[PDB]
Design an enzyme around this catalytic site. Structure first.
Site, PDB file in Angstrom:
ATOM      1  N   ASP A 133     120.128 -34.022 -29.658  1.00 21.99           N
ATOM      2  CA  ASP A 133     120.518 -33.013 -30.276  1.00 21.99           C
ATOM      3  C   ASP A 133     120.727 -33.594 -31.994  1.00 21.99           C
ATOM      4  O   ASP A 133     121.407 -32.920 -32.866  1.00 21.99           O
ATOM      5  CB  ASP A 133     121.340 -31.978 -29.971  1.00 21.99           C
ATOM      6  CG  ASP A 133     121.376 -30.694 -30.457  1.00 21.99           C
ATOM      7  OD1 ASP A 133     120.571 -30.340 -31.338  1.00 21.99           O
ATOM      8  OD2 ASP A 133     122.225 -29.881 -30.339  1.00 21.99           O
ATOM      9  N   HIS A 142     117.962 -30.063 -24.590  1.00 17.94           N
ATOM     10  CA  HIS A 142     119.105 -30.606 -24.941  1.00 17.94           C
ATOM     11  C   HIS A 142     120.293 -29.774 -24.274  1.00 17.94           C
ATOM     12  O   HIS A 142     120.887 -28.886 -25.078  1.00 17.94           O
ATOM     13  CB  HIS A 142     119.040 -30.823 -26.360  1.00 17.94           C
ATOM     14  CG  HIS A 142     118.633 -29.487 -27.127  1.00 17.94           C
ATOM     15  ND1 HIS A 142     117.901 -28.679 -26.941  1.00 17.94           N
ATOM     16  CD2 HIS A 142     119.627 -28.832 -28.135  1.00 17.94           C
ATOM     17  CE1 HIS A 142     117.939 -27.521 -27.637  1.00 17.94           C
ATOM     18  NE2 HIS A 142     118.731 -27.659 -28.591  1.00 17.94           N
ATOM     19  N   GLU A 161     112.130 -24.281 -30.772  1.00 22.28           N
ATOM     20  CA  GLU A 161     113.293 -23.760 -30.471  1.00 22.28           C
ATOM     21  C   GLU A 161     113.811 -22.355 -30.637  1.00 22.28           C
ATOM     22  O   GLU A 161     114.294 -21.826 -31.458  1.00 22.28           O
ATOM     23  CB  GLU A 161     114.386 -24.561 -30.944  1.00 22.28           C
ATOM     24  CG  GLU A 161     115.828 -24.161 -30.597  1.00 22.28           C
ATOM     25  CD  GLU A 161     116.859 -25.094 -30.891  1.00 22.28           C
ATOM     26  OE1 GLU A 161     116.769 -25.948 -31.999  1.00 22.28           O
ATOM     27  OE2 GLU A 161     117.927 -25.421 -30.117  1.00 22.28           O
ATOM     28  N   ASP A 166     116.485 -32.141 -34.471  1.00 20.10           N
ATOM     29  CA  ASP A 166     116.497 -31.585 -35.482  1.00 20.10           C
ATOM     30  C   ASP A 166     115.965 -31.900 -37.058  1.00 20.10           C
ATOM     31  O   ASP A 166     116.490 -31.414 -38.006  1.00 20.10           O
ATOM     32  CB  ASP A 166     117.334 -30.414 -35.665  1.00 20.10           C
ATOM     33  CG  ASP A 166     117.349 -29.380 -34.751  1.00 20.10           C
ATOM     34  OD1 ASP A 166     118.096 -29.179 -33.694  1.00 20.10           O
ATOM     35  OD2 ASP A 166     116.326 -28.493 -34.981  1.00 20.10           O
ATOM     36  N   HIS A 205     119.864 -23.340 -24.490  1.00 22.76           N
ATOM     37  CA  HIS A 205     120.343 -22.154 -25.210  1.00 22.76           C
ATOM     38  C   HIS A 205     120.488 -20.732 -24.474  1.00 22.76           C
ATOM     39  O   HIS A 205     120.552 -19.946 -25.099  1.00 22.76           O
ATOM     40  CB  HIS A 205     119.638 -22.163 -26.645  1.00 22.76           C
ATOM     41  CG  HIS A 205     120.158 -22.738 -27.412  1.00 22.76           C
ATOM     42  ND1 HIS A 205     121.129 -22.516 -28.695  1.00 22.76           N
ATOM     43  CD2 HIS A 205     119.690 -24.341 -27.948  1.00 22.76           C
ATOM     44  CE1 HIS A 205     121.397 -23.639 -29.415  1.00 22.76           C
ATOM     45  NE2 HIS A 205     120.596 -24.815 -28.868  1.00 22.76           N
ATOM     46  N   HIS A 264     117.203 -19.115 -28.758  1.00 21.19           N
ATOM     47  CA  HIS A 264     118.141 -20.131 -29.338  1.00 21.19           C
ATOM     48  C   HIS A 264     119.468 -19.399 -29.033  1.00 21.19           C
ATOM     49  O   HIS A 264     119.646 -18.747 -27.840  1.00 21.19           O
ATOM     50  CB  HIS A 264     117.806 -20.284 -30.690  1.00 21.19           C
ATOM     51  CG  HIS A 264     118.859 -21.101 -31.510  1.00 21.19           C
ATOM     52  ND1 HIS A 264     119.853 -20.916 -32.594  1.00 21.19           N
ATOM     53  CD2 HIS A 264     118.736 -22.508 -31.438  1.00 21.19           C
ATOM     54  CE1 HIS A 264     120.326 -21.947 -32.864  1.00 21.19           C
ATOM     55  NE2 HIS A 264     120.034 -23.001 -32.208  1.00 21.19           N
ATOM     56  N   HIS A 274     115.077 -33.555 -27.974  1.00 20.43           N
ATOM     57  CA  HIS A 274     115.320 -32.736 -29.180  1.00 20.43           C
ATOM     58  C   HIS A 274     115.966 -33.295 -30.152  1.00 20.43           C
ATOM     59  O   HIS A 274     117.214 -33.643 -30.229  1.00 20.43           O
ATOM     60  CB  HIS A 274     116.077 -31.456 -28.514  1.00 20.43           C
ATOM     61  CG  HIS A 274     116.027 -30.318 -29.266  1.00 20.43           C
ATOM     62  ND1 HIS A 274     115.230 -29.139 -29.175  1.00 20.43           N
ATOM     63  CD2 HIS A 274     117.222 -30.060 -30.443  1.00 20.43           C
ATOM     64  CE1 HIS A 274     115.749 -28.349 -30.539  1.00 20.43           C
ATOM     65  NE2 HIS A 274     116.746 -28.869 -30.919  1.00 20.43           N
TER      66      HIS A 274
END
Ligand SMILES: CC1(C)C[C@@H]1C(=O)N/C(=C\CCCCSC[C@H](N)C(=O)O)C(=O)O
Ligand SMILES: CC1(C)C[C@@H]1C(=O)N/C(=C\CCCCSC[C@H](N)C(=O)O)C(=O)O
Ligand SMILES: *[C@@H]1O[C@H](CO)[C@@H](O)[C@H](O)[C@H]1NC(C)=O
Ligand SMILES: *[C@@H]1O[C@H](CO)[C@@H](O)[C@H](O)[C@H]1NC(C)=O
Ligand SMILES: *[C@@H]1O[C@H](CO)[C@@H](O)[C@H](O)[C@H]1NC(C)=O
Ligand SMILES: *[C@@H]1O[C@H](CO)[C@@H](O)[C@H](O)[C@H]1NC(C)=O
Ligand SMILES: [Zn+2]
Ligand SMILES: [Zn+2]
Ligand SMILES: [Zn+2]
Ligand SMILES: [Zn+2]
Lengths: 369, 369
Positions: A288, A219, A125, A22, A198, A152, A20
């Site tokens: 992350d 993650h 996600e 972003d 999450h 999420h 993961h």
């Protein structure tokens, strides 16, 4: 150091596959996805944890790029933005072909390794990206989605997020609703890795029991080391071992040390714990990076993976154990997800009951009787 | 009957490629896209202009299946429903593989012809389906969109619809806004046929001058024969001739006879006119079956094409001319659109100005506002 040298030696054979990152989110936030902006050039990109030279320095061979749209886009423009985010990933691969190899399968990651390219996959996600639609789900699949983070930091009408466990969210589905279970059935049929980062424990447990294939936490860290509800508790870790699943460790400071300050050693503590409770084949990396405001001392960016591996070697992790953490556990789980898929089987088509669709941004065609 | 036998002989070599059929909309409205529902069996489906045996009787070898979401879904759930309609078309081809061959190119259509299968393509009806996003546009392309009807019966923030010409809509963009011009440029680079059905005259003319490839009217007839603003006027037909474009004739009674009652002979009157003004290589079929409440006597459903071809032959259309109307003109235009595309050209990424976006179902990430 001897460990760093061994880390690099091993990483040349088993590059790290991170679960993961972003970066796509930053490209949207910083440049409105305008990849031609010279400030957005990936060979020189500054101000982020990720860029091309950093990826190469960290021996990163595979990466699940996160296609993330915020929770407030749910019942608004979540589907539109998810498409735009997947689009930015597609364009990134085509723009830097000497670096990225867009892939959608385990065989594909392996080919990337052979070619010396950073295998690039898509991880969606948040279930709010499909807007409770099985049709939108299959569409995201066709567009490259290889894992779906069920929620999420907000509930979908069919799955409960982690904030339920902190009291900040109400236990809407108590895990998975009947539609949510069809979503799992559909993800299983398609060959999409189900992602439990999450989500709430009940959702974690419901999914680990329900899924016909091993699942992942793209993650998430160890709850025992840091009691953040974004982390995974031991009983769930035991379920992970039972199902031969995978927890890819998140480097976020507040999930690692439970405070703003954190260092590389504390991340290895989470890795040790996950290895002891869930088993060595259930450990991975899901940093992350570019998705968090704080990363540990020693893990400032994506170029630091060899140092984390060196530390694991210093703590006596065997070569096989670090190779599994690096890429082999993810590959095993990815291959199992592919073996358990059934593209010949008729797709799930029973829609979510109309009374369960939320927001004031839709129409109700198709629904009648 | 000599002309009916000749029509069949010719149609076995050049089956008809219809440019617009709204069966997917019917599958949604009637069964909420549940293809397993027993009533939804396409070999037996009743109450529609289209089904498998009807298609075979009508010698239909190619079809652009319309993926249409109503105008009231604009700034609501247009994108979501567009993916769902694209999905039902994908699933339809998968469920009846002996009948439909899902294709996305002109070579694919010829392959379907060779196999005796109905080439199944996707035509997205209405620019609101992309919610003013170039990323969603590219995503739709990847999902199979091979033509985009710029507008349906409502203006988008970048193109004006046909209602502008009847006074019911305001000429917001006076044709195409600057972003709308970028959309047209992206459509050309991608290799997507630009569809001018449902657009205002200013939009037709702006697109005809701007497009770098020939365009189409997937389901529009002759304005001279029936003064409906959904039809193409002679001056635009002269532009169609100039650009080697294509007008695919709509069978809707009110666009044919300009009244509820109409017949096959009148549709042939439209074909005749287009052939006269736009040329023989600018004519095709886009019946609008399953998208309209009234079809001509003699053209009750999709099995009736041979009778229309027989009439054209009777009227002295040569074999080359009817083969052009049947399949060859669409194939010519498709090949040209494919040759005008550029895979190496950098994708259009300058987004629509924030102030041009409407509705209250979106977020402003990427811009900040
Ligand atoms: C909001 C955004 C940008 C996706 C990333 C994210 O979720 N980061 C996380 C923690 C950072 C603090 C919020 C997490 O993974 O929980
Ligand atoms: C509304 C719907 C179902 C798409 C089809 C449509 O637009 N048909 C048309 C006329 C029928 C209107 C009654 C047209 O193409 O103009
Ligand atoms: C990025 O910048 C490098 C030099 O800084 C240049 O050689 C390369 O062409 C650029 N790539 C893109 C996609 O602009
Ligand atoms: C380190 O692990 C190895 C397994 O490779 C084991 O044999 C050895 O006893 C361990 N070393 C120590 C000091 O515990
Ligand atoms: C449709 O019905 C026919 C029987 O009339 C059957 O043979 C066929 O398998 C059915 N197809 C599907 C997809 O249900
Ligand atoms: C029919 O077409 C042929 C060839 O295109 C032409 O020679 C002939 O004059 C036409 N017949 C009539 C009645 O116009
Ligand atoms: Zn996250
Ligand atoms: Zn993220
Ligand atoms: Zn239509
Ligand atoms: Zn129409």
């Amino acid at each position: 150091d001897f460990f760093r040298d061994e880390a690099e030696r091993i990483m040349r054979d088993s590059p790290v596959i991170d679960g993961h990152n972003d970066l796509p989110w930053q490209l949207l936030d910083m440049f409105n996805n305008r990849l031609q902006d010279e400030r957005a050039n990936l060979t020189t990109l500054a101000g982020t944890h990720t860029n091309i030279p950093k990826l190469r320095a960290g021996f990163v061979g595979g990466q699940f790029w996160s296609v993330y749209t915020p929770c407030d886009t749910q019942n608004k423009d979540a589907v539109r933005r998810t498409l735009e985010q997947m689009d930015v990933v597609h364009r990134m691969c085509r723009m830097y072909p000497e670096t990225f190899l867009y892939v959608t399968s385990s065989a594909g990651i392996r080919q990337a390794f052979r070619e010396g390219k950073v295998a690039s996959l898509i991880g969606v996600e948040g279930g709010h990206s499909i807007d409770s639609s099985l049709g939108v789900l299959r569409a995201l699949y066709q567009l490259g989605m290889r894992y779906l983070t069920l929620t999420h930091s907000c509930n979908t009408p069919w799955a409960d997020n982690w904030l339920v466990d902190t009291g900040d969210s109400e236990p809407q589905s108590q895990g998975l609703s009947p539609f949510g279970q069809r979503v799992v059935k559909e993800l299983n049929r398609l060959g999409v890795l189900i992602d439990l980062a999450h989500v709430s424990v009940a959702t974690m447990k419901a999914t680990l029991q329900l899924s016909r294939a091993p699942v992942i936490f793209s993650h998430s860290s160890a709850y025992s080391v840091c009691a953040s509800r974004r982390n995974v508790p031991d009983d769930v870790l035991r379920l992970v071992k039972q199902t031969d699943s995978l927890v890819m460790v998140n480097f976020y400071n507040n999930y690692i040390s439970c405070t703003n300050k954190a260092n590389l050693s504390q991340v290895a503590d989470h890795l040790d714990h996950i290895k002891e409770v869930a088993g060595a084949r259930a450990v991975g990396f899901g940093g992350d990076f570019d998705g968090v405001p704080r990363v540990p001392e020693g893990l400032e960016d994506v170029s630091k993976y060899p140092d984390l591996i060196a530390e694991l070697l210093r703590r006596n992790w065997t070569e096989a154990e670090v190779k599994g953490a690096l890429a082999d556990n993810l590959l095993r789980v990815f291959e199992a997800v592919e073996q358990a898929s059934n593209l010949t089987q008729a797709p799930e088509e029973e829609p979510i009951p109309l009374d369960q669709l939320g927001g004031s941004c839709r129409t109700h065609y198709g629904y009648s009787s």
